[PDB]
Nucleic acid binder design. Structure first.
Lengths: 157, 157, 157, 160
DNA sequence: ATCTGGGTAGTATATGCTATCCTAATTTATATCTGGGTAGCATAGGCTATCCTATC
DNA sequence: GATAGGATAGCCTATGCTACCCAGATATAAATTAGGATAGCATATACTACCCAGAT
């Protein structure tokens, strides 16, 4: 048939459970269970995370949602396009405002050891799969200053 | 104004306001020479100007585009909620606030930091609707493998 | 439900049967690995193959398969093996003594092709499980002669 | 006359002492005693089978019982029949499995220089006397390999 | 009272979500591919006179 | 004058030959579910000069 609903009542950030994302999250947290890791931090301030890019859009988004479900203590940026970086060799370099076709999403965590573990787990999860999935590159982040947005200084929640 | 002027997504350039903003930036950036370019081509750090407002951020994006040759910009995107004070419990991992951001990648730690510092100081000189701009030293060891194919690489080299 | 009684087929009716058909097909496929004549001009029986061991039914089936595979062979009926000299200088059994192990004997014309048939039967048995592998095969060389010239020309009289 | 039946005690492949079989065995042994040979092997390996055939059924069963008690190490089997073979004429040939009425029984002897002497004795002593028995031609199997020398289970003497 | 820069509506186009087809072990039948056991025709190895010549 | 000697039984011991119909191991096509992915409102920008009032 056609798309079962254009608009589902879910704005940005309204992400529910789904069997595909459920399986992806289960695989990730099984990979994330290979080492003693902490899902959160006491202060819960976002100064680190994971950078994931490359590959097709529909695979990058699914990987983002899977990382979300696997770590309910994470913060995720939306996908967006990319520009073209510096080319190798002394030639005509591209413009700053140009739009590529490569997508990316960013992860906001608290610590960096766990962020490295998450990046490694995502790398393994991608490596287990073919399709555009392997084209999805992953790198690290370290927001030493902060991505501060007032995180409701933790009481009982 | 309004309507499709025929210009596609990502067709902009010089303007006196962004020219002045970039003059201030480079004047701050010219107080100490740094290796603004890298041999490897791929960069090791990015820029994450967030805060202010969408209009101020877009103006600063243009003022950063026309500021240095070693800079390429993503479209502005929004930021995930730290923890929403609206409801009782914590929001979902995907919940995204109204604070915007955009990404431009700079090699080396000092050159990456000074662009953000100049942006902050310039918006501090400006009125307040833009003083709420804060940036972070998002340094990545493994780096980002951006696509280096410049738009004129189809018919030039 | 249907057992096997006297079908009127005397001692010598080598009628085709799918089990014996495929057994013989496999045998002559194995027998096709060497270039040895299946007959001799004078057609005098001075050699053959000796096959024994395993269950009675396996031995009979192997004999029928060798018959169908080589229409230029002569096959003796099955019977029970004797009690050969086992190790141990004790009360050796009677010379007439017979074991519970069955056997059948093949009468061919030459000896090189007889050894080829022996090896082919060995391989054919070896590629099988069940009591089939219990079947043993050894060679024969009737240098004296099992000659018995018939006087009945069954083709026309 | 005095034809009978019923159980007579002894089982399959068991010799007996009868004057006729005694005389046949004495003749064979006397022929076999003209030249000493290794009637058995130091490891008990038989490399020469025996294929007494021909004659008639009764004259062959009696020859079997006569050869039972004349040779130290022999492995005579129950009697069976023989395949037909050739056909009268160049072209036609009978079936492969077609078996004639000439009977035989298998024996085994160690070494190739005692099996031939057994053949000669079991041929002459039983053919150069009875008309209906003058057709037991022997084709003692002169193998170049071995057979199942120990086809025996541990319960020797039908005991332990 | 002009400066002044500095933010700023009003469209084509890329998104966070929710929807809809190739594949990939994963069973799972599906045929095979050989071994049991089925009887008259044949078959052993025992018997007390039978042998009947066949033989002295 | 019995016997050489095959041969003579006939039920005892129990062999097998012809051909199979079942009784399972053993590959092996074919499904099969299930895990990947590919898609629409409603927002989000980029570009559009221009407004347009701080800001004196």
């Amino acid at each position: 048939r056609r798309k079962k609903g254009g608009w589902f009542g879910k704005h940005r950030g309204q992400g529910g459970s789904n069997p595909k994302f459920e399986n992806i999250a289960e695989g990730l947290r099984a990979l994330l269970a290979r080492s003693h890791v902490e899902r959160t931090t006491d202060e819960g301030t976002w100064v680190a995370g994971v950078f994931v890019y490359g590959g097709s859009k529909t695979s990058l988004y699914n990987l983002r949602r899977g990382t979300a479900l696997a770590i309910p203590q994470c913060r995720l940026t939306p996908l967006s396009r990319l520009p073209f970086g510096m080319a190798p060799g002394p030639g005509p370099q591209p413009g700053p405002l140009r739009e590529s076709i490569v997508c990316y999403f960013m992860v906001f965590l608290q610590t960096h050891i766990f962020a490295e573990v998450l990046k490694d787990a995502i790398k393994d999860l991608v490596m287990t799969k073919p399709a555009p999935t392997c084209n999805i590159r992953v790198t690290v982040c370290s927001f030493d200053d902060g991505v501060d947005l007032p995180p409701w200084f933790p009481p009982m929640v």
